[PDB]
C-alpha cells in the first residue's frame, strides 16, 4: 500500500486579540477558530513510525499564538497568508498549509448614541472566513466568505412554470415566503507571494463588505422567480465590482413556511390570499448552489 | 402509588404570523416557538387507560394556530395569556395551563439608509421570553426575559479579595476580559385574569426594553468588582423602573480569557500589561446567580 | 432592595479518572462533567462588592479535581454527596452545596470475545446523572436520572378514545409507531449526612440497573395504551423494587412518525395496514411528563 | 459572467421504512436522512429564469418516498445506486446525481436474552453512510463511510521523537491516553450501472463490518507510536480484505486529555506514573488524515 494523500494539524485553535490606542483610549477585539493543517514529506511518519518529520500539533498551536502576537490579525486574508507562508519557509519538508479562519462578531456597543471604547456585543452568529492554500512554488490561494446570514423576506417571491409529471404534487405560486442561510465565497486571483497579498490589503474588507451589501440588497429587490434566478443576479454583481475575484459560489437553503389550512375549524380562511399563520418547517430543506466566473 | 403531580402538551411548536398594512404596503413578521402543558383531573389516563380526560397533543397544536389566527401574538405577554385561559376554560376539567414561548428575531432591514418592507434578518440569536401559568382561581403569573445576549469588555473589571487558601490559586487581578451570555428575568405581580393583563399590555414592551438597555449600559459603564457586583446593579435598576415587578433574576456565566505565557519563546512579552493574545476557554465556566426583590 | 436568593460556582467542569488495578494490568475509567453551586452568607458580594465572602470559582474547579484524586468517583451519589459536604463543612458561612455530575459512558470494548483491559468505546450518549443538594442542618437530598435513552418501537402502541371537539383533527389508531427519548429521575429519602450515604451505596448502581432494565422490559412489552399509560407502569414497578425512594419522575417525548400518503402517485397503497415509509417529523412533539410516589 | 458549476436538490429528508415479516411477526427497522442534488443543463434557470428545467425540490423529496416503498432500503449503497439512477434515467436533461445516505442505529433490543420482536434503542450516534455519485456515460461511483465511533485507550500509546525547536514546548511521552472520533471512508472501484452494482450487493455489508472490526481491533491492540502510524495500519488491512475497494480514508482528531499537577496542594501527586485525575479539553484538537490506496 501507499499514501496517496496526508495531512494533519491542529483545528479549533481559538484565539482573541486586543489593540488598545493609547492617544484615544479606545481598544479593538478580534476573535477567531483557526485550523492549520500541513503536507508534505511526512509519509514516513504514517508508514514507518518515523516522528522526526512531524512537526507536533501542539507547536502549530504554539505557532498561531505567536504569529498574531507578533503580527495583524486583520484582514483574515492577510493574517492567514502570513501564517501559512511561515510554515513552508521554516520547514524544507513541508510543502503546502492549508489555514482556515472562522472570524466572530465583536460589535462596539452603543451606549446613549455614543459608541463605548471597550464594550461589545455579538450581535450575529454570522460569520467571515477564510480558507488559505499556501503551496510552495505555486503562490497563495485565497477564498473568501460570510456565512450564517439568515434572511426572510414575506411576499416578493414567486415560483411557477418548473416541470410538472407524475412525481409532482407543488402548486405554482406567485407569492410565497422566501428565507435562508446565505453562505458566500468569492475566490481570488491566485497571488504570486506575500508581497502581493501585502499589495491588495485594502481590497479584503471592501470586498466582504461590498459582498454583504450586494446580497442583502440584492434579496430585499428582487422580484424573485427562483432561488437559482436571485443567486446569480447577485454573483454577477460581486463579480462585476471586483476584478481581483476569478469566482464566486453561492450555497443557499430554501427554508420551507407552509400554509396552514384551518378551515376545518368554523370556515376559518388562511390560505392564499388569506394566509396569515404559516408553519416553518425544520426540515427537509432545499439546497441551491451555483459557481459564477467570468466569460 | 398515587400520581403526586403529572403534566402534558405540545412541546416545540414553531409558528410565524405575518401582519400586512393594506394602507402603505408595510409588512412585519413575528416568529416564535410555544410550549403548552396542561394539568387537572388527569390522573386516570396514566392509572387506568383513561383516555378520555385527554385534550390531545395534537389539538393544542391546532388550538395554537387558530389562536394566533384570532388574536395578536405580540406582546408575547399577552398572547400567551391568552392562550392559557383558552384552555382552563374551555375544559371544565382543566385547572393550569402553563405557555412558554420563545420569540426570535426578525429585524427590518435598512436598505440604502431606509427601512425595507418586507425583508429582515436574524440579526442575533437573542430571545425574549415568556413564561405565563394560568391557574384556576389564582390568576395569571408571568415571567419575562432575555436570553442569549452575549457581551464583552476588554478593560475595567476587576477581581481581588476573594478567600485564599490552600485551595486557591487565583491571582489577584485589577484588570481582565468580563465576557457572559446574559439571561435576565422580571416576574410580573399576579395578576387576576386576561382583563388586568391587558390593561397592563404598553409595559410588556416598555420594561423588556428597559431591561435590555440598563443591561447593556451598567455592563458597559461599571468598573465590575466581579459579576455579583455588577448583576445586582443591573437589577435594582430595573426594579426601580417598573413598579408591576416584584422580583428581578440573572443568571451570568463567566466566560474565561486567560492570558498565554509567550516568554519561553525568545522572551516574548504578553502578559499582564503586555498581554494582547488570549485563549477562549469554552469550559469550565463561572455561573453566578441572583434574584433581587424589594424590600 | 435585597437579594431573595443567590448561588454561585462553576459549571461544566469535565473530569477523567483511571483506576488501574496492579495484579491484573486491568484499567477503567470514568468521565464526568460536574456543577457544584453553592449558598450561604454571601450577599454582601453581591450589594457591596465585598469579596472576602466569596470561595472563588476557580477554587471550586481545583476543589474538585482534588477530591476526586482523593475519593472514589463511583458511585456518583456518593462522589457528589463527599464534594458537597465538604463546603459546607469546610467554610462555616457556605450553608448549602448543590452538585451536578453528568456521567458518560465509557464501556469496555471486546476484541475477538474478550474484554480488552484498557480500551473503551462511548456506546450511548445516554448519561446517567445525580443532583446532591447538601444543606447545612438538614442532610443529604439526592436525585438520581438517567436521560437520553432513545427507544422506537414500530408496532403494539394504540391511541384512541380521548376527547374530541372543534379543535381535535387526529384520527384514533389501534396500531402506530411509538419513540421517545428517557428521562427518569428517582428521588432518595433524605439522609442524614455523609455516614448514611455509604451505609447505602451498593444501592446506588443496582437501583440505576433497575430503573433502566423496567423502563425497557415496559416499553417492550406493554401494549400500549398511550405514553401516559406506559410510563406510569414504569413507576409502578421502580418504587415496588427499591423502598429507599420516595419518588419517581418521567418526563418522556412523542417523537411523531408520520405516514406518508403516495396513492396520488399511481394508486400506491402505504397507509393503515399498507404503511411501510412514514416520515419522521423533527418538530412539535408531545411532551408527557408524570410524578410517583407512594399512598 | 456564465455559470461554470451549478447543482440543486433536496437535504434533509428523514426516512423511515418497516419491512415486517408475516411469518414469524418479526419486524426491521431503518432511518435514514437522504439528500439528493442534481446536475446538468439547468443553467437557463439561473441566467434567464427559465423554470422549465427545474425538477422541483419538492418532487425530488416525493420521489425519494416513492423509491425507498418500491426498492430494498439497504444496504444502503443499493438504494443510492437505484434512487440516483432513476434521476438520470427518467429526465434527458439531467446527466448526474449526487445522493448522500446517512443511516441512524436502531439496534433490536434484547429482553431477557431474547432478541424482541418489535422494540430497538439507539445504541450509538456512530452513523454509516454512503454517497453516490451517478454520472450518465460514466457509471457510478460508491463511497462508504462509518462516522462517530468514538473510542479511547488509557495506556499503550506513546509521542516521542518529533521535530523539536523553538516553537515547541511538548514533552516526549511513553505513556498518554488516546482518544477520536474515527471518520473512515472506503472508495469502490467504479461500477459501469445498477446491474453491476446488484451483482456485489453481498460485498457491502460485509465489507462495513470489516472496516469497523479492523478500526476497533487495531486501536486496541496497537501500541501506538502515534495517531498516523497506528491509522496507516487501520487502512492497509481494508485494502488487503477487499480487492473492490480502491482507496481507504481515514481522519481522526486527537482529542487531548492534559494531566492535572496539585503538587502545590499538599505535595498531591498526578504526574506521570502517578496521574489517576485529568482534564479532558474539549478544544483545541489534532487533526489527522490519510487516504492510502495500492501499489
Ligand atoms: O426557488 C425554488 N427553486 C427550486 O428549485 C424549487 N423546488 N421547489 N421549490 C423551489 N423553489
Ligand atoms: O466575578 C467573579 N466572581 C467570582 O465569584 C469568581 N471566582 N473566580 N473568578 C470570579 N470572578
Ligand atoms: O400517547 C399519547 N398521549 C397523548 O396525550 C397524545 N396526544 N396526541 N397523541 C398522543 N399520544
Ligand atoms: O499522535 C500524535 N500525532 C501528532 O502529529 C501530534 N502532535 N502533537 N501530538 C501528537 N500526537
Ligand atoms: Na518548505
Ligand atoms: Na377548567
Ligand atoms: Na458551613
Ligand atoms: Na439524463
Request: net charge neutral; charged share 25%.
Amino acid at each position: 500500500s501507499a499514501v496517496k494523500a496526508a495531512r494533519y494539524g491542529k483545528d479549533n485553535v481559538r484565539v482573541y486579540k486586543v489593540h488598545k490606542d493609547e492617544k484615544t483610549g479606545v481598544q479593538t477585539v478580534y476573535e477567531m477558530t483557526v485550523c492549520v493543517l500541513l503536507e508534505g514529506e511526512i509519509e514516513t511518519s504514517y508508514t514507518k513510525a518515523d516522528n522526526s518529520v512531524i512537526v507536533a500539533t501542539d507547536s502549530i498551536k504554539n505557532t498561531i499564538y505567536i504569529t498574531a502576537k507578533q503580527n495583524p490579525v486583520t484582514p483574515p486574508e492577510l493574517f492567514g497568508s502570513i501564517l501559512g507562508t511561515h510554515f513552508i519557509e521554516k520547514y524544507n519538508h513541508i510543502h503546502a498549509a492549508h489555514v482556515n479562519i472562522v472570524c466572530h462578531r465583536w460589535t462596539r456597543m452603543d451606549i446613549d448614541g455614543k459608541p463605548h471604547p471597550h464594550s461589545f456585543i455579538r450581535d450575529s452568529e454570522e460569520k467571515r472566513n477564510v480558507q488559505v492554500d499556501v503551496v510552495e512554488g505555486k503562490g497563495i490561494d485565497i477564498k473568501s466568505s460570510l456565512s450564517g446570514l439568515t434572511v426572510l423576506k414575506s411576499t416578493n417571491s414567486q415560483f411557477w412554470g418548473f416541470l410538472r409529471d407524475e412525481y409532482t404534487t407543488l402548486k405554482e405560486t406567485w407569492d410565497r415566503i422566501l428565507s435562508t442561510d446565505v453562505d458566500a465565497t468569492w475566490q481570488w486571483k491566485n497571488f504570486s507571494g506575500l508581497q502581493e497579498v501585502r499589495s491588495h490589503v485594502p481590497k479584503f474588507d471592501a470586498t466582504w463588505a461590498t459582498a454583504r451589501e450586494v446580497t442583502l440588497k440584492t434579496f430585499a429587490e428582487d422580484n424573485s422567480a427562483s432561488v437559482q434566478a436571485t443567486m446569480y443576479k447577485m454573483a454577477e454583481q460581486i463579480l462585476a465590482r471586483q476584478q481581483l475575484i476569478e469566482t464566486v459560489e453561492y450555497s443557499l437553503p430554501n427554508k420551507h413556511y407552509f400554509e396552514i389550512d384551518l378551515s376545518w375549524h368554523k370556515g376559518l380562511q388562511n390560505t392564499g390570499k388569506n394566509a396569515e399563520v404559516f408553519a416553518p418547517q425544520s426540515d427537509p430543506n432545499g439546497l441551491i448552489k451555483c459557481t459564477v466566473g467570468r466569460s
